[model samples]
Every structure is written in C-alpha cells, then in structure tokens.
Target: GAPIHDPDFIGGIGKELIVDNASDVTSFYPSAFQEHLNFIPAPTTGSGCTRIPSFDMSATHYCYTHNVILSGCRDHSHSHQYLALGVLRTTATGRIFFSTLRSISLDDTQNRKSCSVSATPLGCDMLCSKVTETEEEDYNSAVPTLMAHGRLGFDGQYHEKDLDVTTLFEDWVANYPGVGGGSFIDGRVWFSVYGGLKPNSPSDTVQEGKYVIYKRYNDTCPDEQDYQIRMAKSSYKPGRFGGKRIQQAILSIKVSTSLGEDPVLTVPPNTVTLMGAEGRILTVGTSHFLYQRGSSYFSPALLYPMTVSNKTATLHSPYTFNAFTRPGSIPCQASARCPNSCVTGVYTDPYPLIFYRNHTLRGVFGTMLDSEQARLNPASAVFDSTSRSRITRVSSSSTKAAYTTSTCFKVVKTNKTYCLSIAEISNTLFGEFRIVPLLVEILKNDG
Candidate 1:
C-alpha cells in the first residue's frame, strides 16, 4: 500500500521526507525526526532587533549619535524613502554649517519644498576656512569654532542650542610670526543621526521621539587645510557629496526591533557598500585597506579590516575635505617643507634635488642653485669637505643628433663672419753719394 501524507505537518513548519522505497513500499514516508527540519516559528526570536530574513529587505544605511538615530533606504525598483539625520549648507568663501538630525521625507514634493524653506537654525557655523596661497596666518582672523548641541523633540524638530565659542583646536592651530594671537579658522565639525518617530509636522514642537547624535569628522587633514565632516541633507538644498537630499554620514547601519529606541547596529558578514569622500563614493569591504584614500578626504565609512575582532566591527565617517589653514602654508606641516629650524637660513638644508639637462652648444652642463639662500647665509649649506675617490669613467653617453651634432661651429657662424687682410711696402735707393731716392708702397687684400 502507498504511504499516507504526514498528518502532523503544520503548514510546512517542520517536516522531512524519508526514502523508505527499499522496503518495497516505494512511497515517500515522513521522518520521525522533526527537530532536524528547517522551519520558522510563528513568533520569530533572536537579537532584540528586527530579524531581517534577507539582506534585500534590510535597511541599507544608518548612523547614530549619543541620543539620536537616522537610517533608511529606497526601494531599489521604484519608490524612494527620504530619511535624514542632519542637513548641511556651505558658502563659496569656504564657510560650512549643518543642522541637527530630524526625521525627513522627500517622497512628497510639497513636503520637500516646505522643509527647505522652514528648517531653522540653518545649522551651526564650522570654525574653518578654505586655504589658498594668498591667505595669511593670523589666528585672530580665523573663523570662530562652534559645536552642535541641541535636543530632539517628538515633533521632528531640533530646538536650537546656543553656540560654544571657546573650543579652539589647539593641535592644528598655529602661532606664526607677526600674528600675536594664535587665532585661525581651519577645521570642520562632527555630527551624528538618531532614528525613530517624530511629531505631527516639521514645524511642530512636540517631544515624543528618540534623541541621537552620531558620525563625525574625527580625522583631520593638516596639509589640505581641509577637514572631512559628515553631512546629510540641508533643509532646502539638493545633495552634493553622494546624492541630493541624502545624508552621506551614515555609511554603515545598525538596527533594533523596539520602536522609538536608538538602534545599535553592526557590520554583517560578507557585507559591502560605498563611502562618500569629497563628491564620490568609494567601494569598501571587509578586505579593503584603511586610509586607502589617503589623508582622510575619502576613506572607508568604518575603520578597515571590517572585522576588528571576533565580536566587534570598526567603523568611520566619510571624508569631506574642508579648508582650515592659511594659503601657501605647508598643510599640516608636511615633510615637503623644512620644520621650524630657523627663519635666518642659519641651519637650513639645501633645497631638495631637481633634474636638469646640458646645453652642449653653450659648452655648459649646469643647474640653478638657490641664490637667496647663499645671499642670506653664505656658509649655511656649504659642502667644503670631500671624500677621496677613484677617478674612473663610471658612465657616459653621446648627445649626438643625426641632424646637427656640434653647436660650436654653428654658434660661431651665427654670431659673425671672420675676415683677413694683408699689407706690403717697397723702398728704392740710388747711389750713395750721387742721388738717393726712397719710395714706399702698400697693398691690401681681404678675404
């Protein structure tokens, strides 16, 4: 007789088939070992966060701060979800600023238009400026440093907080000559996002949602005179670094299941994503190198070696090169310039080597030496001592050209033509006592 179907199979929840045809029944028999079967319980459970069954349905990007969280993704096929933690705005003269994280939605064109115009605090001004060759190194002239400090309300609005004016980035600031005060503006600020619900409207002042702040310009670029700060959508402006009206600061995401709670995220295995630096997004993975972009302009969203240890993953913010030093100043005191040895050229080293070629026609093989250094301190870089060495033709090469080999003759003719001349004289004398006559004749020839 044919075997009967498994009567206890609960909608494919837990059931397995066994091959019992060897016994002559030739039928599919249900296995008694139901524990080995793959199944999903009605009330799924694991980490407190939502158990995303598949990566496709999970949140792609997220960021956080001490008390705020912001994360979301667009449906790859059609509809888009606009979420924001903060908004950034900048000026042509290099001033940068951004607002606190709040829930945002661009899916509604009318809502986006209204958000752009009504968002307040515009954002806090960053204490940095663009670097150029013509800029001066006066600290007093630098932009005032400001930090973002505010509380998120339930109404999706971040009530403004007063600015802090005394936080000077001492390590990066310099005290150059003639500049009495060590005052300068040359760095950007850091920010983060919190995810949750908001009040009834963008203009509401309710207090019911979660609070958060994450992502920041933790790294700095001394040479570029620029600092990379994280930026999301500005109230009314389009995206710049990665996408218009999108927050690029949240490179990696973490999620929690409890509604209205801040999500503590982690990097999943075999996960891959792009990081924004300047204006481009770079590919990043578990095997990618750290600081690969060099100088923090565009680097991994999180730290390198995605897997920090068996239980932890490291992450970082995307770079946004913002100027913070005077023009022409060696950015961040790079190796290209001599360190502060002296200004009088007393202990300065010779200028680094530069390549040159010989002009044979001029009978000279030479290079230009620093004249200013010599004039300032004649003995500063003199190399008077030498080591005894063998006199040998170590290397040589012919500078022959098929068209014209030597310039000696060419130069001589090019300058002027040489000429030759000849002269002659003749004299005749008569008898000594009778008549004497003397005559002289001269002749000339030229070539």
Candidate 2:
C-alpha cells in the first residue's frame, strides 16, 4: 500500500485524480422546448387513447389528462387496455402549459409547431401569453364562442344535413349564460346526436330512410381566450347554474396559424401583446366600533368579522362571489349589503364564506380596515397545513449591499508633529471604492 507509483507506474490508471479550483459550470438549453403548456389524454376500454400512470415526483403535480382503450374477446371485449399516449404543453413560455411529459416529442426535428390567434373586434391580437392574462382579467373576453354547422359523410360526398345542432345545446342549456361557467348541476343525460341522415347515392338516389343519430361535440379546448365550453353526461347535466363539476372543458387553444394535421406545431407570435382582460373581481373590507377611548385596538377580541355575498348576477354567467363582483367592470355592490346587518357582535354573519369557490379566479383580497375598506396586514406571510397567506408589514428591517472605494489613513515621519490630514480621509474612501473596481476588472481581463 505504501509507494504505489514505484511498483508499477502506468499513466492514466485508475488512481482517482483530482483537480482543484475549477471554473463555474453553466447550463445551456435550446429555446424550442422552453415554455410549454400541456394537456394529456388518457384512454380507456373501447377508446384508443393511452394511459398515464401517476409519477411520484410531486403530489399536487401529477394530475393530468391521459387515455386508455378497450381490448380482447367478448368477455373482455369492452375491457380497456392501455395504449397510445400524448401530452401537450405551451413550450414558448416558462410556465407548464399542462401536465404529462408524454405530450412532448423527443425528436425535436419532427415536432409540429402551429398556433392560432384571433384578432378581436377591438383589433386586440390574441396569443398564448396574452391569453393567460386575459383569462384572468375580463369576463366579457372569457373563452371565445365556438359554432359549427352539422354535417354527414354521404355517398362519396360530404353533405349538409338538416338537423338541430343549436337545439341540442339549447335543450342542454335553457339559460345559456347559467351554464357558461360549465358544471354538472342538473342531473340529466343529454345526447349529442349529430351526422346521421342524408341521401345515400347518385345512381341509387331513389331510396331515403331515417336513422337514429347522436353527436358529441367535445373538440373545443380551453387554452385560447379567457374561458371555454364543455359538456358532460346524462348523470351530470348542466343545470340553470353551471353546477359543480366540469365535464368537458372547451379550450381556447387557438394559435397564430394552423399547421399540417398529421402532427401539429403551433406557431409562436412574432410581436407579442398583452392578452385581453380576464374579468375577475376583488373585494375590500373594513370596520369601525365605538372603542373604549384609551383601550387597546390590537386586542383579538376587538377584531370585527365581516361577511360578503354576491349581489348582482355574475357577468357572462350566473356564478357569484361571496363579497366580490364578477371579474370585470362590476363593482362590489354598495347598493346591496349594509354594514352590521348580518353582524354577530364582533363577528359578521356569513363570516366563514367561500370567495371564489368552484368558479375559476385570478386574484382576491383579505385585509383589515378602519370603517372604510382599507387594506392593512403587518406580517408578510404565514404557512399552514391547508393553505398559505402573505401578510405585508409596512415597517421592516432591510440590509442593503453597495460597493464603495476608500483608502487607508497613513501618516509620514516628516510630519510627525501630531497632525491628521483630511486628505487621508478622502483618500481612504476613494481607495476602497476605486481599488475594488480596479481589482475586479483586472481579474476579469487577465484571468
């Protein structure tokens, strides 16, 4: 074990060489796959989609759409087996557009890139980045509406079929706006009957018959504008109010332009603009009391509780906020709720309320007030088991980092008659600031 090199010295042997003082390593990545949003579809029996098994990397992050399909003989004929898989994400931005890594193609060369962005009536240009913001701001600019004429493939030709497409959605949604938020409130199964009837032939154009048909329009995506549309089963119908659970969600995934159908590549925007508004609402609350004149206002018991309820119909939909208006121009109603009307002494009635429950949202507010609705939170943030809250303190300590040049004070023997020159003070300051800068530059260039 002693003197290993003397025994049989061979260059490049497994001697565990080490190099100290290495340069800092930097990471490099291509831009194509940088920012993406993904949506994965899972297939089940009889369906040809693929399945996405859950991964353990993150608890709240694994939820995504996947696909599976049915296979085998009669006994298991309808039983589905996992098959193909697909995932999609918005790759231009840093945000994870959706979930499921399978949507991304590893072969960078063959991936399709297509995009669709519609110009609004106001000449507003839409793109993925702007759409994200628009979705969170204005309700009127929610998800764009989608419409199509009914059709059927017939006798070597595609023919227009006389049928009720609008009727189907109408029957599903009597109060259309009520269901735009899209939920399963009414427990009824509605069939989407499309493309069943047409004349069958040119040479044999003599025969005409009736065929029972149903249609399912689940093609719209939610990545386009602010909101989207979706449909569900007979068990979970869209009620007067878009109920609770979302069945199918129309995605606002329109891109700048369309690409080939085999594999789609969404086009990225060249010049970008802010997406339209999302039309979400915010709420402010405050309170006042005839406090014991010199008493402590900081007592927790002296804290007043408040409750908020929706006063007006939600914009573009029937959804309501506890104390906020629909996302856009609607103001928190001064017309409706009066202070102390529903108060229970120190606490207000309907205190424990759901502000943005079930409905999609962007932002909200919770603050302490003094009579008028004013915001005041001292602490930055507090973490808890279920949720987190950030409290901002107006007064707080801060450590600032700055660079300065200064020189050390020096005295010469010729001037030994106890004297201090103020020039040395200036030199010390100048040396500190200048020396540091000069050294930094020298190291950068010479090294």
Candidate 3:
C-alpha cells in the first residue's frame, strides 16, 4: 500500500489506485455489481501471498504462479481483493516442470501443513497447465482444482500509467467530474484491451499467430456455498495449435470438490481425468479472473456471490469477454504485453523475435517490423518440450547443461517471413527448430 500511493511519485499518476475506490465504482449499478460488490484486500497478517518475480525491469523474464482463492460466501465475510497470485516459477526452456505443484489454502495455514501435487502428463504450455490428478492416500480422490496460474503482473503495485502518458491524462479526466466518460475508469481508455494484456496474440512478422483464451471459468466444482461455477474466456474464434482444435473449453482449468465428502472415493473430475477433451468440463481456481459485464476483466468470486445448494455453487456466466476484433497489436514500446513488430528483441538463444512473454494472449498475431535484425539475424529460442514463456535458473553460475536441455541452434529465414514453430521432438525432453509445423489458423463467423 505504502509503495503504491505516496500522494506523489513519478508525478502523482499513481493516485488511480487510491481514487479508484470512488463512489463511481463502489455504488451499485444494475449490473453484476448491483449490490455494490466490495471485495478489497484485508490481510489478517503476513502478505496474503508471494512469488512475484523480484520486480526486475532490465531482465526480460516470464513466470507461472500459484494462488489460493479465499471466497467470501453467505457468512464467511472478508475482503475480496486479496492478491492471491503467489510466487514465480521461471522457465528458460519454456517447459513448466513441477514434479510437485505446490498448493495452499486457509486450512493448510490452520494446521500449517504443506503438500505438493504433480504436473505430470507433460507440464504446461505457453498458456495453461497440464493434467496432474491429485489422489489421496488410501482410497480418497480429488476434483481437479484449477487456478489460472499466469502472473500478468509487471509488479504488484503497478498501474496503467506505467504504459502510456495518455493513461495518466485519462485518469485525470476520470477523477475530475464532468470530463469525458465522467467518473468511469476504463481499463482500456488509451488502447484496446484486446492486444494490450499479453504478447504473441496478433501473429507477428514470424507469423507466430494464435493467443491463449485466458481466465477460463470452472465448468465444474461448487464454491464453499455449494453453488456451481461456469467457465468463460475472451470470445475469440477457435484456432489451431500443435495440431489440436483450440477453444476456451480446451484451455479452461480443472477444479474439484473437497475430499472429505462422502463421494470422495468416487471423485470423478480428478485433475488427470478432466485432461480429456472428449467429454469433461474443467474448473477454474478462485485465483483466476475476467469480466462480469462489458469489457473490463475481474474475478467473479471477488464481485459476484454464488448461490449454493447441496454442495453445488452457481455463478452467472460472465458474458463472453471483449473478444478479439480485427487485427493490429498494441504499439510495441515496452511492458509485458501482446505482440507486434516495431521492436525486435531476441529471447534465450537465437530464439526468434517471438520467444514472447508467458501470459494469456488474444487477437492479432503480434507482428515484427520489416528490418535488418529480423531479416538477416539467425534467431534462437530455448524452449523445453512444452512452449512455456519463462526460464528457471538453478543458480547464477549454473549453465544449460546443468538441467536436461538442448543447446541453441540457428534456422532458415525466408521472404521476410518470421513464421517460427516448434516441431514436437518425439520421446525426448529437449527440442530444437528444424521446421515450423504447428499452424495457427483462426476462424470467426460473419462479422
């Protein structure tokens, strides 16, 4: 709190965090927040969570996170804005490997016990986590608990001003009455939310098309109140990646019910089982978020109350997110954002211009500027079997050889076409680029 609002810093542009709680937001609208959904962070003690990358601007890094969603039910009244996003797990090889995926909740703190789940069946992709069904000792089973673990934070205390001078001006018009949209704070005033959040969306010069439909809902699993949860995502048309038909349902996280229930033995949606794309729906964690109405994105558990009955919780579907419109990416100046040309910085090794960051991306394929660096330079990317975004370091002195990985190599470029793809290297942990196979093809209906 102190770090973000100092009444003055980098020119008082930081006031948005403080003034954002204005009556404009707190007051009830006929919308989802009609009852004035006010869920702010109130840490009982200690930081609600951790694992934000050590806040480095110079180091181009990426990360996956772990979180605990403390839902405010009918009676368990508490603040909702607890930054549940946990610590960072960087990956140099792009593979999100977690022999034991760590998970914690209030109960774990009461007993203060700790446990680790597996990230088997091949770990995460650049966007979502893989299937790892957690089964209890003896005969109990668990429902796949899905928490969209992408840490989209540049830093915990970061705000919109970090991106544009225009945002600073927009905040002023918002704070001052009778100016432009008046008191409303548009998360995307200066830019489109479509390509503003993550990288790799609008296929760039390399033709690295396709974006992850982040913040999928929990198609299964009820809340503490026992109401059911439904999953949703930015409604972009379906696309193909790694040879599979990709959609919001394909990427939605898997959540489960408590193992203490009588049906614990027959728990059907264990993480591993939900991994099947054939017939099961996945669940999302309390940590995930998106919009409830309009284009603004937020977590439903934080703003909307779920009706519970018989151990099944129900939350209204957040109408499809501000889906991808036409092409075009955020003007590529800086920050952890979507794709585009203009800037061509290499990642890992000769990793092509698009070793892009690891966050939920959508919209156009972030294209690259037609330039010398992109045209002649032989780029390299150090990605593990899976196409995750960051890199994990064993230590400062440790080298690539330390872990199970392949060294970087060069590849061919053509017709100013930077379309790079990862061809699956069968039966091996390491991977290299010999050809671009996974084609990203998007299909939308009559617009």
Candidate 4:
C-alpha cells in the first residue's frame, strides 16, 4: 500500500488522499509510470484490436446524467498508471455521440495497427464511428461501420497539450443533415470505455474507442426519444466482438445545480426494470462544482472520478465552498459598509478587522502622533476610542479590492507592541455571511 510512483500518474493534489480511500481504486490505479501517458495514434494495420488491450473485455458501465455521460475502469490490463475514461456526448434531441480524447496503449507499435487511419484533417487518426445496435444485438453484431468521423492529428503525432474532440464532433453533427440538420443543440460531453479488443494480435491492442451515435429522430427512428442510454459488453472474440448496445434501466438519480442546492442529495427509490446481460449497479454517484483553494472560486469543469466508492468526492459534508464577492464593491474609506469592511487606509496593531470571503477590502492606519496632536486632525482616525486608532486615512485616494494592504505605521508609544491581522468571515457556497474567529497574522512588533 505504499503509494505507487509513476510519472503519468498525475492525479493532481490530494491524489494520495483519494487513492488511500479507493475501495476498488486499487484495481483502477495505473501501474505504469512515465513522464506522460503514451499517446497511440490510430492503427494503420487492420490487425490490431479496436478496444483497449487486456482491459477492454472487463465489465464497465456508462454513467449518464441529463447533461453528461461517462464510463470508466482501471488499467490493470497493462498495469499502466492511468485509467481509461471513454468519450461520449448526447445531442439536444437525445441522440448519443462518442469521441476519443486520448488512447491508452500496450505495445508502442501495436497502437498504430489498432488505431491506424488514413491521413486526414485531424493530424493523427482520431475517428469516432457510431454503432447502431439494440440491447438484443448481443455479441453477434459485426464491427460498426464508419458514420461520422474526426481525427486527432493530420500528422501521426500529438503536438497539442490535449485536443477537445468536440470540434470534430460539433463539425460532424452540424454537417450531418439528419437530426437537427443544422446543429445538435442539446449535446453534453461524457467519458466512455472501449468494447473487447480485436482478436488476431500479438501485443494486446489498446483500441482508440468508439461512439454509439444513437439513431437520430425522424423517419429513420421516430421512437428514439423513448429510451435511456446504456452500455453493454461483447462476448470475447479473437478479432471481432461487439457488445455495445442501447437499453433502458431503473436509475435512482439525483442532481444539483450548485452548492447547497441540495442539503441532502440522495438517489430516489427505484422500481424500474434493470436491463443488461449481467447488469447490476456497481456504484451510484453524483458530480458537483469544486472550488479550488487559493483561487477562491468554483472551477469551470465539474470534479472528476465522480465515483463515490472513494472518500475524495466532497471536502466536507453539509459541504460548503469558499465565498466570493462582486468586483469593485469594497472601498478604502472607513465608513463604507462592505459585506466585510475595515476603516480604509488604516493599519491597526494587535486588533484586526473582519471581512466577508469575497468582498473587496482595504486598510488604513497611522504611526503614533502625540496624544495632543491626535485630536486635532479630523482626517486622521481618532486614537484610543473603542473604534478609533490614529492612522492616516491614507489620502482618501480610494483603494478597493479584497485582501488589499495599506501604508506602514510606527506608534509613537515606546516599548508598546502592535501587529496586523486579517479575520476570516464565514461566507460559504451554501451558507449566509457569519464571522469566523480565525485570524491571519500579517505583521507584528516586538519591544
């Protein structure tokens, strides 16, 4: 259980925390470690399998929400330090789509055969063909024909950091005049897995992946909207196996738009029929926006590894995120009431001001002036009053922004100690503004 050390094992921060709690993640933890996950261009030779190497035949599920779909399993097949998250998407009308972002590989050259494709616009062969199979087609189905396709590169090499296959997906959906004809509006991207690998291969083939483009609604299949999306496995075939299918299942699903949107998000009871050759719910899960630390903001993409099997899903229950404020709202002036505010331009020692999480903030304080002179300057903060401290208003020039600092000060009183600190206000993604007793020390003085 010592953590696996692999360079391609970029689980991001808190990776250890996640891996430690993975009830089944040990199976998914990639064993191979390198600078980067190996990139496998499509196979030029037709002999390589289209599914992932040894891992392609394992049981997996397609997790679907109203807006997204994803399927995944560990890479124990090759023991690589990466999990294969498949590509998937759905159109506005419910027509499902699939595409690949990256392909995991076993042997270096074998990938070229399993994933090879003719030279095209997208440098390397990054093609996504749709399979039109019903849950009953079972494993007898032949390899799906190429319908709409896209490439990762025109040159057999990966140069970009990462490519969003959506460009070609959108392109295919737009040009294909069947569904919406112009554009598939209700498209949501998802992660998917490959079916079993092709037979007749020396090295295990790491297939590029495929798209299960559900039939579009029209004369072709008017009843397409009546069913829910699902995935299936193919019977093992040396060179050919097809198990991918579409079916309906009883899903106890729950969704939330933002933090605190649901105090308790639980899957409702299920009475619907569960369909598949060997279908049994592996895990029930949900996804939410994660606020990145330091950024103090919710990340644009939803959190990943949505599997609840691990404890890394949420930071804390009755979960909450760091609060944020509107730009330009906090002021440098003392009297202005910011959601959290301090007398602007003043720096006080020993005592700190409290502010809301995201509101703009500024400070102002002055060096010690004679007790006699302290009373004379109206522009200067009063000294010794319950809320008064002799600090320059710092020239009402007006500074505004969260965590803003002010001019330094020297108290005239000898041997007296002073310090600056920031008090946190509890403003959360789901909670109202409240003061937190926590204080962050910024500066201190010693006799």
Which candidate has the top score in TM-score? 3
Give the backbone clash total of model 1.
42
How would you encode candidate 4's per-residue C-alpha lDDT over 1-447 as one tens digit per residue? 111212221221111111112122112111111122122122223222122111110011111100001111111122111112222222454222223333332232111111112111122222122333431242343332222222222122232121222331211111100110000001111111122212322111221121121111121322233221211011111111232221111111111111111111111111111111111111111122111111101101011112232211221111111111112212312222111111112111111111113311112121221121111111222111122332332123332211111111112222111221111111324222211111111222111
What digit string (tens of lDDT, one per residue) describes model 1 on residues 334-439? 1112111111211111111111122001011001111222211011110101111111110132211000000000012122111100000111131111100111
Candidate 2 ranges beyond 4 A from true positions? 1-164, 170-327, 330-447
Against the true structure, what is each candidate's TM-score?
A: 0.17, 0.17, 0.18, 0.16
lDDT scores for all predictions?
A: 0.17, 0.16, 0.17, 0.18
**lDDT per residue as tens, model 2, 1-447:** 111111111221111111112321011000111222223222223323232111111101111111122331112212221111211122333122223322221111111101111111111111111111221121232232222211111111111112232332221111011010111001210111111111122211221111111111222223333211111111121121222111111112111122111111111110110010111111111211111000000101111111121211111211211221111111111112211101011111001111123222212111111111111111111111112233322224321111111001101212110100000001121121110111000011112
The candidate with the higher TM-score, 1 or 3, is 3
Q: How much lDDT does candidate 3 score?
A: 0.17
Error of 1 at 380 (Å): 54
Best by lDDT: 4
Q: Is candidate 1 or candidate 4 better by lDDT?
A: 4
lDDT by residue (323-388, candidate 3, tens digit) is 111111222121212211221221111111111123211111111111122221111212111122
Candidate 1 Cα misplacement greater than 4 A, ranges: 1-140, 150-154, 162-165, 168-447
**Between candidates 2 and 4, which one is better according to lDDT?**
4
Residue 4 displacement (Å), model 3 = 26
Ranking by TM-score: 3, 1, 2, 4
